[PDB]
Amino acid sequence: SHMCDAFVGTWKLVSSENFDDYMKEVGVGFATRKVAGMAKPNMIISVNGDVITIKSESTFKNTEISFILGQEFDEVTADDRKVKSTITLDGGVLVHVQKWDGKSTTIKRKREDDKLVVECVMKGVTSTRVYERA
Ligand SMILES: O=C(O)C1=C(C(=O)Nc2ccccc2-c2nc(C3CC3)no2)CCC1
């Protein structure tokens, strides 16, 4: 047992707050914001050795990242940004930093009760997205 076992599984979006404004701050255009905001993703998290895989599946896009904690990777985001990402575990929270064009955004994933809470921060704007087990 490890590290992320409390994250592993299949998770479904149950609430979102301030996601349109988060997306505006990251630079997402109108049409992508409207369709992305309407998405109801499932989040599938798995671990195999040192490799963590996170899949986000929705009607708008299916995206998947695999990574090793602390080891930077190049990522293409849902909104088609090319970013440099690093994911670490800090005090039981998965912290995902994306860097591009001299900007930065941080996505934190934490277990809280029976939920997986995703907090997304860009400049002063926070979005909170709550998932429960599927
Ligand atoms: O995993 C989550 O809750 C989180 C996100 C998400 O769900 N995104 C999406 C899920 C389906 C479809 C589209 C998106 C989409 N995100 C974005 C830009 C904001 C990045 N453009 O489209 C993004 C942050 C964490």
UniProtKB/Swiss-Prot annotation:
Keyword Phosphoprotein (UniProt): yes
PROSITE patterns the record matches: FABP
GO cellular component: cytoplasm; cytosol; extracellular exosome; lipid droplet; nucleus
Record motif Nuclear localization signal, residues: 24-34
UniProt modified residues of type N-acetylcysteine: C4
One matching Pfam family: Lipocalin
Protein's GO biological process: brown fat cell differentiation; cellular response to lithium ion; cellular response to tumor necrosis factor; cholesterol homeostasis; fatty acid transport; long-chain fatty acid transport; negative regulation of DNA-templated transcription; positive regulation of cold-induced thermogenesis
Effect seen on changing E25D: In a breast cancer sample; somatic mutation
Residues the record lists as Phosphotyrosine modifications: Y22
Tree of life domain: Eukaryota
GO molecular function list: fatty acid binding; hormone receptor binding; long-chain fatty acid binding; long-chain fatty acid transmembrane transporter activity
Record remark: domains: Forms a beta-barrel structure that accommodates hydrophobic ligands in its interior.
Subunit structure: Monomer. Homodimer. Interacts with PPARG.
PANTHER family, per the entry: FATTY ACID BINDING PROTEIN
Family stated for the protein in its record: Belongs to the calycin superfamily. Fatty-acid binding protein (FABP) family.
UniProt-recorded name of the protein: Fatty acid-binding protein, adipocyte
Source species: Homo sapiens (Human)
Biological classification of the source: Eukaryota, Metazoa, Chordata, Craniata, Vertebrata
